[PDB]
Write an enzyme that holds these catalytic residues in place. Structure first.
Site, PDB file in Angstrom:
ATOM      1  N   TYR A 127      -6.981  10.289   8.757  1.00  0.00           N
ATOM      2  CA  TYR A 127      -8.077   9.641   8.059  1.00  0.00           C
ATOM      3  C   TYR A 127      -9.187   9.421   9.051  1.00  0.00           C
ATOM      4  O   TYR A 127     -10.359   9.573   8.722  1.00  0.00           O
ATOM      5  CB  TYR A 127      -7.628   8.301   7.491  1.00  0.00           C
ATOM      6  CG  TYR A 127      -6.616   8.412   6.373  1.00  0.00           C
ATOM      7  CD1 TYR A 127      -6.703   9.427   5.417  1.00  0.00           C
ATOM      8  CD2 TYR A 127      -5.580   7.489   6.262  1.00  0.00           C
ATOM      9  CE1 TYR A 127      -5.783   9.510   4.381  1.00  0.00           C
ATOM     10  CE2 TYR A 127      -4.661   7.563   5.233  1.00  0.00           C
ATOM     11  CZ  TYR A 127      -4.767   8.570   4.298  1.00  0.00           C
ATOM     12  OH  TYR A 127      -3.864   8.618   3.266  1.00  0.00           O
ATOM     13  N   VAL A 163      -0.526  12.023  -2.308  1.00  0.00           N
ATOM     14  CA  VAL A 163       0.458  11.803  -1.257  1.00  0.00           C
ATOM     15  C   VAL A 163       0.716  10.344  -0.900  1.00  0.00           C
ATOM     16  O   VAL A 163       1.864   9.920  -0.800  1.00  0.00           O
ATOM     17  CB  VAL A 163       0.056  12.577   0.019  1.00  0.00           C
ATOM     18  CG1 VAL A 163       0.858  12.086   1.208  1.00  0.00           C
ATOM     19  CG2 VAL A 163       0.281  14.066  -0.192  1.00  0.00           C
ATOM     20  N   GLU A 164      -0.348   9.576  -0.704  1.00  0.00           N
ATOM     21  CA  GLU A 164      -0.200   8.169  -0.343  1.00  0.00           C
ATOM     22  C   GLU A 164       0.259   7.295  -1.505  1.00  0.00           C
ATOM     23  O   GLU A 164       0.328   6.073  -1.378  1.00  0.00           O
ATOM     24  CB  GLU A 164      -1.517   7.624   0.204  1.00  0.00           C
ATOM     25  CG  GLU A 164      -1.342   6.804   1.458  1.00  0.00           C
ATOM     26  CD  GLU A 164      -0.955   7.654   2.642  1.00  0.00           C
ATOM     27  OE1 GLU A 164      -1.241   8.873   2.599  1.00  0.00           O
ATOM     28  OE2 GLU A 164      -0.372   7.110   3.611  1.00  0.00           O
ATOM     29  N   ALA A 165       0.561   7.927  -2.635  1.00  0.00           N
ATOM     30  CA  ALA A 165       1.010   7.223  -3.831  1.00  0.00           C
ATOM     31  C   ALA A 165       2.504   7.443  -4.053  1.00  0.00           C
ATOM     32  O   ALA A 165       3.133   6.769  -4.870  1.00  0.00           O
ATOM     33  CB  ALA A 165       0.224   7.706  -5.044  1.00  0.00           C
ATOM     34  N   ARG A 174       4.637   7.416  -1.380  1.00  0.00           N
ATOM     35  CA  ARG A 174       5.287   6.603  -0.355  1.00  0.00           C
ATOM     36  C   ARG A 174       5.303   5.128  -0.713  1.00  0.00           C
ATOM     37  O   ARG A 174       6.165   4.383  -0.266  1.00  0.00           O
ATOM     38  CB  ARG A 174       4.582   6.772   0.996  1.00  0.00           C
ATOM     39  CG  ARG A 174       3.350   7.660   0.975  1.00  0.00           C
ATOM     40  CD  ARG A 174       3.407   8.677   2.104  1.00  0.00           C
ATOM     41  NE  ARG A 174       2.459   8.380   3.177  1.00  0.00           N
ATOM     42  CZ  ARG A 174       2.008   9.288   4.039  1.00  0.00           C
ATOM     43  NH1 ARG A 174       2.419  10.546   3.954  1.00  0.00           N
ATOM     44  NH2 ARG A 174       1.143   8.944   4.984  1.00  0.00           N
TER      45      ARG A 174
END
Lengths: 254, 234
Positions: free
Chosen positions: B100, B146-148, B150
């Site tokens: 990021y 993707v960050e959802a 985890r």
């Protein structure tokens, strides 16, 4: 990887304390949470909860009460404790668990049997305050407090109304935010009646725990939080068993 | 444009890149992955402008993406990744990585200043199918996809969105969770001797921007939220 140090909260957000300081045989009491040295417990690799140098032992002047003692002068069985996600803190050898007779400050802490009560629910962690979250459930409906905080079904989320907000205390009890006195209760589960809100009497029926399977389990009966079917806007919620229903799934959006 | 379709979606992402759990929370596969199985491909369509993501199943990173006859690998892509990714295409290389801090530098903006939801990755995919200034579309794609997987919490953010039918940006809640994914894990795997107690205080913010000092795993913000954990030990 060897030894970590946190805190131990419980009944109505009161902390687990060691009567003043002393050494050897000093009972444990329920004291308001503070960053005190006699308030911090060192969780170790051999399972011995130690504090002011001494381990947490189970005494028996007849009964059984938590207490500190030289880790070398105490018998293993009496020094090994076991903490589980259900919120319990047990002593495998005795089979007795840490319990708090009454929710009162400076009140002696006692050790009893596993009733799975809320009077025996703890939470190891530095953060001890009540976690105020928003519990979401079936069909993206939130959990609100039907009528005067005495019944609760589901309703659309407003995203800012305290009726759907809930406080999570270290004693594994779901309580209201604008009235931390009454809290989530069960009933005579044997036959889907209904879950609502009564005053926190501390029974093994007001204790819930959010498991990793995505649902809220109630240690006592190993049942989980479910709905009567789908009716969520003026109906009720019940206690049913492992049916893998997507309706038994809830998520505490903080 | 449905929650179930999207739910099932990330579900298939969570139970496809996970080896045996620890505290009830699954964990990604360790070095026990052959370069012949370290890459997962995900498809993404919209107005029929679709892409393909090449994520690392060990740590969940996007190593490149296809665009019909063109692929684009991130700068941090190892050699062995080009020779067996979208080889039958006209390969390319980007000037930044999947971090990021990188894609932030690129875009010139960042997650907190970036709207998410259906009406977001909708155009996110467009910029991709097309081309350039797609850095941002990586923010509102990696995060939305993707960050959802985890964190059940970011899924319920990208879900409660499709719900309320609005748009929104990533608050301090998702950011802290996002950047503390490496610590959390390490701290939850290294914390086996202290039986449910880390060694430091990881700070995560609630929705009301209230800083939270998580000390153990006995907090809902951990057992209920974490859905996939990175594999690190102690």
């Amino acid at each position: 990887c060897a030894a970590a140090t946190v805190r131990i909260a419980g009944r109505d957000g009161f902390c687990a304390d060691v009567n003043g300081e002393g050494q050897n045989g000093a009972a444990i009491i329920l004291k308001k949470c503070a960053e005190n040295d006699n308030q911090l417990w060192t969780l170790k690799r051999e399972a011995t909860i130690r504090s002011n140098g001494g381990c947490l032992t189970t005494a028996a002047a007849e009964q059984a009460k938590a207490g500190i003692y030289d880790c070398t002068q105490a018998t293993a069985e009496l020094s090994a404790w076991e903490i589980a996600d259900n919120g319990t803190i047990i002593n495998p050898a005795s089979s007795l668990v840490l319990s708090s007779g009454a929710a009162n400050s400076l009140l002696d802490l006692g050790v009893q049997t596993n009733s799975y009560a809320s009077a025996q629910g703890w939470r190891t962690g530095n953060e001890t305050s009540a976690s105020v979250t928003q519990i979401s459930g079936s069909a993206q409906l939130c959990m609100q407090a039907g009528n005067g905080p005495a019944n609760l079904w589901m309703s659309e989320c407003r995203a800012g109304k305290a009726e759907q907000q809930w406080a999570l205390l270290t004693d594994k009890s779901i309580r209201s935010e604008t009235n931390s006195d009454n809290c989530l209760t069960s009933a005579a589960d044997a036959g889907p009646k209904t879950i609502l809100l009564a005053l926190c009497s501390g029974p093994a029926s007001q204790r819930w725990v959010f498991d990793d399977d995505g649902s809220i389990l109630s240690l006592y009966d190993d049942k989980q939080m479910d709905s009567e079917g789908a009716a969520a806007a003026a109906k009720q919620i019940i206690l049913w068993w492992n049916a893998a229903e997507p309706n038994q799934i809830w998520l505490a959006l903080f | 444009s449905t929650d179930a379709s999207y739910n099932a979606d990330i579900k298939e992402e969570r139970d496809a890149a996970e080896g045996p759990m620890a505290h009830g929370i699954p964990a990604l596969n360790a070095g026990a992955l052959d370069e012949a199985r370290a890459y997962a491909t995900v498809d993404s369509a919209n107005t029929d402008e679709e892409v393909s993501v090449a994520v690392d199943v060990t740590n969940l990173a996007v190593v490149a993406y296809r665009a019909g006859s063109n692929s684009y690998f991130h700068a941090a892509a190892p050699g062995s990744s080009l020779s067996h990714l979208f080889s039958r295409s006209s390969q390319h290389t980007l000037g930044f990585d999947n971090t990021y801090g990188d894609m932030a530098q690129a875009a010139g903006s960042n997650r907190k200043a970036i709207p998410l939801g259906a009406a977001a990755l909708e155009s996110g995919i467009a910029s991709l199918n097309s081309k350039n200034p797609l850095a941002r579309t990586l923010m509102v794609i990696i995060q939305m996809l993707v960050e959802a997987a985890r964190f059940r919490y970011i899924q319920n953010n990208v879900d409660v969105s499709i719900e309320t039918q609005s748009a929104f940006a990533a608050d301090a809640a998702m950011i802290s969770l996002e950047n503390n994914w490496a610590n959390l894990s390490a701290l939850v795997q290294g914390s086996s001797g202290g039986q449910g107690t880390f060694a430091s205080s990881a700070t995560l913010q609630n929705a009301e921007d209230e800083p939270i000092i998580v000390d153990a795993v006995y907090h809902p913000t951990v057992a209920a939220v974490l859905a996939l954990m990175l594999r690190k030990a102690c």
